[PDB]
Amino acid sequence: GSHMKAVQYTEIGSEPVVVDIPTPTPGPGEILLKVTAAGLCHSDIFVMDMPAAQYAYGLPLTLGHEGVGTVAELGEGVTGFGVGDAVAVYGPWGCGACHACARGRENYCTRAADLGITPPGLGSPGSMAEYMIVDSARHLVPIGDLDPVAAAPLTDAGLTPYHAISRVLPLLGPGSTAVVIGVGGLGHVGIQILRAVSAARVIAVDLDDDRLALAREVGADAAVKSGAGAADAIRELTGGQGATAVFDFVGAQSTIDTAQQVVAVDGHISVVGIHAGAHAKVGFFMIPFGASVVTPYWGTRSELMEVVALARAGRLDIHTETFTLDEGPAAYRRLREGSIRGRGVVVP
């Protein structure tokens, strides 16, 4: 096919539309994938709600940074995969040559911004299209016979909480407690990860009893309703010792405040969710001694392989709702109104 359907963000303030664009051809070192599943996440809405001044990803933009597909054509000199191999796309592309990239932590590449290296669906053409280009073979991770619909969320919904947990995993030994705030998209996977790679007790925190009920099924040992009573409730569940780690996937100021009120001495707060302006206040007597705080970014490539390994072993169960490519824009309206059970996935 000389052209292909793609869900694109074409102008500021408008809804994404299904438009026809040229089918890309892989240059030297590139790989062309036939997309088999493309995930939607709230970060797409956040990007699409940016005003004209702040948005810096160029228009038009093919959406979709949660991509999985099969190798369709290999660019010149690309060995490592064969036509038909099922692969997941590593999102946070880096330069590959800086100290951070050499350590595997391409998500923390120190030259990507200066060089204009952007992830697919966030500056580079995304996965919500019949075909997509991947810049390099090192940004492809094999998935074997993993169902592509289940695999697509793993590239962000799985990778991002996995990285946040991995940053302080040595603290989550037996006897530790991990608090998960927001047990929807990412927190649901975070709970499953915590139970798989650690023996820590998991406390779920969310506004909706519906979300709390599911959190208990996937391993959460206790559930608390979000609000002004959450802090007291969490400490009541842990005596007065606090939570070794708090993974806030909401990112609102109120949830960060709850995290700072319950984190243990020498603990950790991970601000994963994004609410513009929300921030933790790290100062003496405003947070326990030794309790570190960070805003993590996506994850490393080796962590993506580990997330795939968890899924192939039956340890990650991602709730998905499938959509057609033509249903792409409709799916984003569904995501906007919070009417999607778990994760939305477009199957071209």
Ligand X SMILES: CC(C)(C)[Si](C)(C)OCCC[n+]1cccc(C(N)=O)c1
Identify residues 99-128 at the interface with ligand X (CB under 6 A).
122
Token look-up 């010149």 returns 76
In whole angstroms, the minimum distance from the beta carbon of 55 to ligand X comes to 11
Q: Candidates 64-72, 118-126, 283-291, 338-346: pick the segment binding its own copies (CB under 8 A).
A: 283-291
In whole angstroms, the minimum distance from the beta carbon of 147 to its own copies comes to 16
Residue 157 CA to residue 186 CA, distance in Å, equals: 5
Which of residues 130, 156, 248, 306 is near Zn ion by CB under 5 A?
156
- Secondary structure (DSSP) of 101-133: HHTT-GGG-SSHHHHT---BTTTB--SSBSEEE
Residue 307 near its own copies by CB under 8 A: yes
Residue 219 CA to residue 214 CA, distance in Å, equals: 9
Task: Give the x/- contact pattern for ligand X in 280-309, rule: CB under 6 A.
Answer: ----x-----------xxx-----------
12-34 burial: b if 16+ Cβ within 10 Å, else e: eeeebebeebeebebeeebbbbb
Which residues does residue 124 pair with via DSSP β-bridges, in sequence order?
A: 120
Which of residues 4, 37, 38, 41 is near ligand X by CB under 6 A?
41
Task: Give the x/- contact pattern for its own copies in 220-249, rule: CB under 8 A.
Answer: -xxxxx-xxx---x--xx-x-xx-------
**Cβ-contact 106, 48 below 8 angstroms:** no
In whole angstroms, the minimum distance from the beta carbon of 163 to ligand X comes to 7
Phi, psi of 217 (to 5 degrees): -70, -35
Residue 309 CA to residue 93 CA, distance in Å, equals: 21
In whole angstroms, the minimum distance from the beta carbon of 66 to ligand X comes to 8
Could you say which of its own copies, Na ion, Zn ion, none residue 258 binds, taking C-beta under 5 to 8 angstroms by partner kind? Na ion
Residues near Zn ion (CB under 5 A) are: 41, 43, 66, 94-95, 98, 101, 109, 111, 156
